[PDB]
Design a protein around this ligand. Sequence first.
Ligand SMILES: Nc1ncnc2c1ncn2[C@@H]1O[C@H](COP(=O)(O)OP(=O)(O)OP(=O)(O)O)[C@@H](O)[C@H]1O
Ligand SMILES: Nc1ncnc2c1ncn2[C@@H]1O[C@H](COP(=O)(O)OP(=O)(O)O)[C@@H](O)[C@H]1O
Ligand SMILES: Nc1ncnc2c1ncn2[C@@H]1O[C@H](COP(=O)(O)OP(=O)(O)O)[C@@H](O)[C@H]1O
Lengths: 1092, 735
Amino acid sequence: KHFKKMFAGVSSILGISSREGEEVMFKTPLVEKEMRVTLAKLLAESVTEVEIFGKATSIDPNTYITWIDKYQAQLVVLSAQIAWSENVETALSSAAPLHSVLSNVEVTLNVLADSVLMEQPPLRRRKLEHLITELVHQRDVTRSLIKSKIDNAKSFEWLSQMRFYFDPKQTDVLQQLSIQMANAKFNYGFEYLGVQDKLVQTPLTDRCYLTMTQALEARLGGSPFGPAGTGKTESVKALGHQLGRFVLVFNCDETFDFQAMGRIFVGLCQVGAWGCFDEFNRLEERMLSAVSQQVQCIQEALREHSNITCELLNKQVKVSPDMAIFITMNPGYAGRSNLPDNLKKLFRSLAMTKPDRQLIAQVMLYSQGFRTAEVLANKIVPFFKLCDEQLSSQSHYDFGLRALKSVLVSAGNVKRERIQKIAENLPEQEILIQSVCETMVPKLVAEDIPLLFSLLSDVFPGVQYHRGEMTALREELKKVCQEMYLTYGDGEEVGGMWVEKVLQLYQITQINHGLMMVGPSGSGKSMAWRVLLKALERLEGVEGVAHIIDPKAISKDHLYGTLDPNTREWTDGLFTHVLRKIIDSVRGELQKRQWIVFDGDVDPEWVENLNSVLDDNKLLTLPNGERLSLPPNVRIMFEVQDLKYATLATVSRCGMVWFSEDVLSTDMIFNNFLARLRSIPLDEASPMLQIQRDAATIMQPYFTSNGLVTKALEHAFQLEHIMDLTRLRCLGSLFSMLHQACRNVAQYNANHPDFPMQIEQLERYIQRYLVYAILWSLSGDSRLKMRAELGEYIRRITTVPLPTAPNIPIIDYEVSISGEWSPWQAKVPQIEVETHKVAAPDVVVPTLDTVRHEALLYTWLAEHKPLVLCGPPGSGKTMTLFSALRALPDMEVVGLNFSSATTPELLLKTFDHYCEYRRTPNGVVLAPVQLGKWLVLFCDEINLPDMDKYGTQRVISFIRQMVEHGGFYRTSDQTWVKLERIQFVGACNPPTDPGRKPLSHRFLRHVPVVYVDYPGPASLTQIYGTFNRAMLRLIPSLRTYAEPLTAAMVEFYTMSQERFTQDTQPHYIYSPREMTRWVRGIFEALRPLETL
Amino acid sequence: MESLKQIHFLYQYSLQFFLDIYHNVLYENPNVTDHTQRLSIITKDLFQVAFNRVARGMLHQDHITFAMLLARIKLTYDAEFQHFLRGNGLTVEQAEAVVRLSCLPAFKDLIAKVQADEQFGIWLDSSSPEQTVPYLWTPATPIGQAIHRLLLIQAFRPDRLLAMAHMFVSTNLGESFMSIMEQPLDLTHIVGTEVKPNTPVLMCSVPGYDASGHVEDLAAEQNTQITSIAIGSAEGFNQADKAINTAVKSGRWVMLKNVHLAPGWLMQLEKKLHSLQPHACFRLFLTMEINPKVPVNLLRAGRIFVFEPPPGVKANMLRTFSSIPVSRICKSPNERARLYFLLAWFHAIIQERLRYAPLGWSKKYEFGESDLRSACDTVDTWLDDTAKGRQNISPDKIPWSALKTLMAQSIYGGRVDNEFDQRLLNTFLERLFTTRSFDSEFKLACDIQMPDGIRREEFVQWVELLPDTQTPSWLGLPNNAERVLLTTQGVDMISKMLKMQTLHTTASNWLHLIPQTLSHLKRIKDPLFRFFEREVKMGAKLLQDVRQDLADVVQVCEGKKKQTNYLRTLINELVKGILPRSWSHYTVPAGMTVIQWVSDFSERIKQLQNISLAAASKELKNIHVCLGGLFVPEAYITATRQYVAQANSWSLEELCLEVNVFGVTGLKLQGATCNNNKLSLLPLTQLRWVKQSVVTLPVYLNFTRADLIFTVDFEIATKEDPRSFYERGVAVLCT
Ligand SMILES: Nc1ncnc2c1ncn2[C@@H]1O[C@H](COP(=O)(O)OP(=O)(O)OP(=O)(O)O)[C@@H](O)[C@H]1O
Ligand SMILES: Nc1ncnc2c1ncn2[C@@H]1O[C@H](COP(=O)(O)OP(=O)(O)O)[C@@H](O)[C@H]1O
Ligand SMILES: Nc1ncnc2c1ncn2[C@@H]1O[C@H](COP(=O)(O)OP(=O)(O)O)[C@@H](O)[C@H]1O
C-alpha cells in the first residue's frame, strides 16, 4: 500500500505492478537501481527491434500489434521518438528521404487509426491512443519542417525539438540514451513512470517545454503562471515523463513551516527527484523570503557541481545532480498574496493565457476512434468560445480546458457504451450533443438553457437528441422516495424537475470524480443526494456510507490536522482521519460506496488545499511528507449556497449541479408535511395518530395548488421584515405550530375522558388555528402595521370565520380550545404588585404583547426547536423569554454571551461545565446532568460572532451544524457527538443596527425569528402606572399623584428618545430599562423617609 | 534637506549626515592657500555635494524638485517667483494661464505682443521650444531671464514645464550639476569613505527591480567573505543575530534581504547597533521595498539608496556596460561586442517602452537584469558553439534565427502574455537582429547612425555623444505620448513645492440634481431580440437599484430617519468619491469616480431607452449602438453572428467578419486615421459577416487596455510600413 504514495505512482512490488494493470519483470534473477537497469536493457532491445521496420513503407499488422503488446506503455512511445529522431537526423544530414519519413509516419498513423475502429481491450487501447497522440505530433512537426525549407541539422527549426539520441556503443547503459534541446543535454531517468496520460503537444505547450528545458540546463527553476486551468501542473508532469523522472506534486498552504520544506528539499536531494510546488500565492509573504534563502543556497552547490554537499537545516548533506524545482502561481485572483522580488530572480516565467483548444480537441478525439474528429473539433471549440462569451455573468460557470477534456472523455465513454449497446458509422455529431447534455446542461440556470440549446441547434445543425431514461433507477427512486414521505414526478408532473435534477446528479457523479452543488438555501440538495445514495445502495447492493464534515465552523488546524512545532508530530484532522480509515480498510471500507460531503460555505483558505486530489493522479500531501493516494470508489462533494467568494482554481475542477429555487416548489413541501403528519406520530392506531389524521383530512384543501397558504406566502414577500424572508423557515414555523395544535387537542381529550373531541368542533378549532398560525408564521418578524396588512389579505383570501370587531386586527385574537375567537384582553387582568416587588428583577406586568409572545415562545419551545428573538434594545426579550420559561417546570436556562471575538470553544466549555459525555452503542451522546430535565442555551447576542473575511461567521456555522444534524465533531477524539436534550434560543438587535452584520440564510432557514418591539406609549403608560400605584403606597397621602406622574416621565422618555440616538454617539441607547432604573431610584428614595 | 520627509515619505534626514557633509567638504575636498578662492570653492562644492548625497536616495522625478530649490538657496526675483507656484490660435486652457500671467507688471506685454509676432504659431508647434523662447516683458541677468521665460513657457506650453526646469538649474548651479545622476552608482567609493560602521546601508527597491545582486558583486569584487540571511523566520532571525555578532567582532560583511516584512526585529536592530562599537570596515546591508511599514528610526540612521529603471535611453547603456565585466565583452570574436551592443540597445528600448504605458506596451511587464544576464549567457553560448577556434566571423554565419526565437519565446517573451505584445516583440527582434545590422549605414531608429567599431572601447564615447534632447520617437512611439506624462510631472512640481513652502449637506445637494439627469427604462427565439431583452432587463434592474439607493441617501441626508447600516457606507463612499461595490457590476477603469459614473450612466440609459423603442417598434437589424455602452459587447457580437448564421443557414464556425468604414457607432481610433478602408498614419462602422497586406488592430473597452474583445482587419496606405503600425501603437478604443 505504502508504495502507492511515495515511490512513483506504481501500485505494489518478481516485478513492478501498476494501477492500470501492466506489470514489468526483472531481467536479472536496491529497488531503484535494479528497475532502471531492467528498463534500460528493455529499451536497448526495443530500439534494435523497431529499427528493423523503421522504413515503414508497408507495415504488417500482426508483428506491429504483437510489438505493442510485448512491451510497456512508456517504452513503446519513447522508442517512437528514438527511431523518428535518428531517421530524420540521417535524412537531413544527406528532401526525398524527409518526404519518405513523412510518408512512413502517415502510413503508421493510418494503420493505428484503423485499429481504434475495431474493438480493442482498454490496456492496448490506452497505449494505442498515446501512440496516435505522439504520431500526430510527429506528422505535424515533420510537415512544419517541410513547409519551411531547411538544409542541415544546425538550423534552429530542427534544433529546438525533442530529438532523442541513442548510442548503441555506450557501455554505461544508463547513459546509453540522451535527449537534446536548445543548449540542453540531458539523460533520461528511466524511472518506471508507468502509463499515466500523455498530453497534446501544442505550440504553446511547446514553448512551455522549451523555456523550462533552458532553465534546467542552467541552474534555475520554472514558473508557469496565468489564469487557472490551462495545463501548468500537467505540463510539469509532461516534462517529467519526457525526461524520465517522476515529479512529486505538492500543494502548498499556510500550514507549512520552514522545517517541512527543509525535509522536502532534503528528501529531494538525497535521492535525486523532481519537485512541482503548486502554490506560492498563499504561503505567507515573510515565509516566501525564508524559503528563498534555502532555494538560493541549494543552487550555489548545484552550480559548483556544474563547474558535493550543501546545507539544509544546518546539516551538510549530499546533493545529486538530478534535482529540479518547478513552481506554479495563479496570479491576479483576489484571495491571494504577492511575491518577494528576489524569488523571481531565480525562476523563469512563462504565461499560459490561451491554450490551443483546436488541436487538443482534434487529436485525442481522433485517437478515441472518431472518423470525422476534425470537423467535430472544429465545431465544438468555437461552441465553447461562444458559450464563454455570450452567456450571462454567473460566477459558477467553468468552460476552461478542463471542461473541454471532461466533455470529450464523456463523449468517448458514450461512444463505447453505444458500441456495446449496438460499427463503422454511428452518428458522431449526436454523441457530442449527448455528452454536452450530460455534463454542461445541468450546471446552467433556467435563464440560459434556451441560449445553450439554440447554440447546440446552430453549431450542430440537425442530429437532434432525444433524452434517455434510466427506468430501473427511476423505479428504484419511486420505491425509496415514498418511504421517507417525499414526492415523485415523471419529469412533467409537479415534482418532475427535482427528480430530473437527481438523475442529472447521478450522471455527473458517474463521470466527475469531484462533485459539487450550488443553489439557494432549501431547494433540496441534502434530500436529493440522500435519496440518490439510498437508491444506489438498494439497487446495486453495495452499502452506501455518507460522512458529513462542516469545514467552516471547524478550525483549519483541527480540520486538516497540524504539525507540532516543538517536536515534529503529526496530529491528524477530520479529513485526514477519514482518508486514513478508508485506505487502511479496517472494517472493509474499500468494498463500500463511501461519500464525503462538505456542507457550509466556501472560502479559499480550505477549498484550494484539495486542488491536489481533484486533478489527475488524485493524491493529498501533508507537511510531514506523508502522502495519501485517493481511493477510487469515494467521491468528494460540496453542498454550498453561492460562489461570490471562490476562485476558478477550484470552481473548474469539480463537476457541478445547480438547483434553482423553483426546482422545489411549495406543493411538494405541503405534501411532505402532510404525509409526515399522517404517518409518524407526534408523541415518541394511537389517539395521537387519529387526531393527526383527522386534522390532515380537515386541512388538506388548504395545502394544495393556490389554496390559502401559498396565496398568503406569495403575498408576504411584498412586505418587509427585520431581514430577508425565506419560504422554508416560514413553513417550518407553521408546521411546528400545527404540531402544537395536535398536542393541544390531545390535552383537551385528556381533560374530558368521558367527552372526546367532536369533529364539528374540531373543524371550528383547526381552521381558526390555521389562520392564526399563518398570521404568526408569516408576520412574526415584522412590525405591527405589516401584521395588520397581512391580516387584511388573509381575511380577503379565505372563508375561515373571523371576528366582527370593526377595528381590531385579527393578529390580536386567541383561538380557544372551545373553538372560537377570544380577545387577548381576557388574559391580561389589571394586577397590583406587592409593596416590596414594586421594582425587582424577574417581574412581569402583563400586557397583550407580553402574553402573545409568551404563548408563541411556549409553542416553539414545546417542540424543542431552536428560536431567535430580535428587535431594538429594551424590547424585553430576556424577561419575556424567562417568563415563558417560568410557566414550564421542565426546562432550565443557561445564560451565555457572544463577544465579537468569540469562538465555538465558548460553547464547548459551557457544555463541558453543564453537560457530560457517555459512550453508547449508538455512538457518543452529549447529555445534560439532570435526567429528563431540558437544558436551554440562551444566547443574548447571536449576530456578533467573529465575522470572517468572506462573509460567514464561525459560531453561526457551528450552531447550524448543531441544529441540522443534531451534533458536532469533538476534536479531542475527532468523533461524532450528538445532542440529547438541548435546544438553542438566541436573541439579537436588528442587523440594521450599526456594528451588527446580517445573518446567513442557510442558518436562518432552520430557526424562526420573532420581532419584539419596545411597548411604546400604549403599554408603557399602563405598565408604569401600575408601578406608580404600587410605589405610592409607602406614602398614603401621595396616591393621588400616581397617574399624573406616569404621564410625565413617559412623555419625557418620548421627548428624549426622538432627539438623542445613535446618529450622534455610538451609545445613545434609550430603553425601558431606563424606566426600570427610574422606578428603582424613586422607590429606594421614598422607602425610608415615610413622609414627603 | 530635512523638510523633504513630508514629500517623499521614503528618505529620512538627520543632523549627523549634514555634519558629515562638512566633515567631507572641509577636510577632504581637493583645494591654494588663498582665503577668497577657498571660500568660493567650498561654497560652489557645498551645493554639488548636497545634491549628490541626497539625490542617490530618492526617486528621479523628485531630483528636479530638490535641485531647483537649491537654485533658490544660492539665489531681486522673489516677488515674481511665487506667481508660478500660487498663480493657479491660442486655446482656452492656454488663454486662462495667459490672462493670469498678464496681471503681473513684468508680463504686461502679453496683452498685445502675442498677436504681433507671426512666428508664434511655429514656436508653439515646435518639437522643443525650450531651446528658444520669445521674450515678452533694464536688461536682466541670465537668471532673471530664465525665470521670466519659465513663467512664460508655463503660461504657453505647460507640457514643457519640466524640461525648462532642468536648464534653469544649469543657469544657477552649473551645467554639470545633474550630470552625475545619469551614471552608474559608485558603490565601492561610497562604502569606502562615506559610510561609517554603526550605519546600515539601506537599499530601497521600486517594485519590479531589486539590488540584492549588487552587494554580492561588490563582495566578489573586493574578495571578501560575506554572510547573507533573509528575513521572515525565527531560525533565520537567530542565525542573523549570530552573524551580526560575529561580523561585529571580526569586521565581516552582513546582508539582510526584505527587512520590510519584519518591522519588530528591524526596530530592535537600530537600538542594538547604535549602542555598539564594532570592528573597522564592518558593513551591514539591508534591502527593502518602498512602503509605510519600515521603522522611521532605521531610516534616520542608515545610508539610503533608491534602485529603479534609470531614466533616459542614454543612462541604460552605461548601466548595462558597467554590469557586464570588461573581460567578457572583449572576448573573441570581435562581433561579440556588436551583438552585445545590439542586445543592450534592445533592452533599453523595451524598458523605456514600459515607462510610456499603456500606449507602448499595454501590460506593465516586469523586466530586470536577470533577463539581461540570461540573454547574455545565451549569446555567449551561441557564439561559443558557432565560432569555436576562430577570431573573425561573418554576419551571415551568426545564428540570427535561433537568437531571435529564444529572445522572442523563452527569455523575454515568457513574461509576454498578450498576442499583440508577442508579435511586437517579434517585430523588434526581426527588425534589429539581422545581417543588416552590420552594414555601415544601418539605422537603429528612423535619425540615428550605428557606430562602426569592433571593440568595446569605441562604443563607449558614442553613448554619451547622444544628445540629451530625447523624444519618444527614438522608441517608435509617437512623440505626443510625452504630453500625458510631462504634464503629470509639471503639476507634480507645483504641488510638491507648495507643501515645501457638513457631509450630509454636501451629499443632499450632490443628489438633488443627479435624479434629474438620470431617466427611467421601460421593459421569441430571435437571436438579436433575446440578448437585447436580457440587456434591457439588466439595465432596468440595476437602474432601479441605483435609483432606490440614491433615494435612500436623499432621505437620510434630508433628515427623514433611515439612519441604517449599509447607508452610512454609501455616505462614506459618496463623500470620498470612491465607486462603491454595490454598483460595479460591469467593467470600468480603475479610479473612475462617481460623477464620471453618472455621466456615463445617463448616456447608457438613453441608449437603452432607444433600444427599447426600437425593439417595441424586425427593425432590430437597422439599429445603431455604441460598444462600451453595452454591458456585454461580446453578447452583441455573438447575437449579430448568430443572426447572420440563421438568416443564411450557415454553420456558426464558417462565418468570418469583414469591416468597412450592421452599424456600430461611437467608436474611436487612436494613432491614425482612415478614409477608404486604408489606414493612414470612425463616425460609423459597417460590419459584414462574410463566409469562410492588412493589419489586425484590437478593440478595447477602456484606455487601460486590460482585456480584448474584438479584432478588425484594416488595409494600409501605400506610403506606410506595415511593421511600423505595431510599433507606433494604433488602436481602436470604445470610449
Ligand atoms: N423534493 C422534495 N419534495 C418535498 N420536500 C422536500 C423535497 N426535497 C427536500 N424537501 C424538504 O425540504 C426540507 C429541506 O430539504 P433539504 O435538506 O434537502 O434542503 P437543502 O437544499 O439541503 O438545504 P440547505 O441548502 O438550506 O441546507 C426538508 O423538509 C426536506 O424534507
Ligand atoms: N496539453 C494538454 N493535454 C491534455 N490535457 C490538458 C492539457 N492541458 C491542460 N489539460 C487539462 O486541463 C487541466 C489543467 O489543470 P492544471 O494545469 O492543474 O490547472 P491549474 O494549473 O490551474 O491547477 C487538467 O485537468 C488537464 O487534464
Ligand atoms: N413589556 C414590558 N413589561 C414590563 N417591563 C418591561 C417590558 N418591556 C421591558 N420591560 C422592562 O425593561 C427592561 C428592558 O430591557 P431588556 O429588553 O430586558 O434588556 P435586553 O436589551 O437585554 O433585552 C426589561 O428587562 C424589563 O425590566
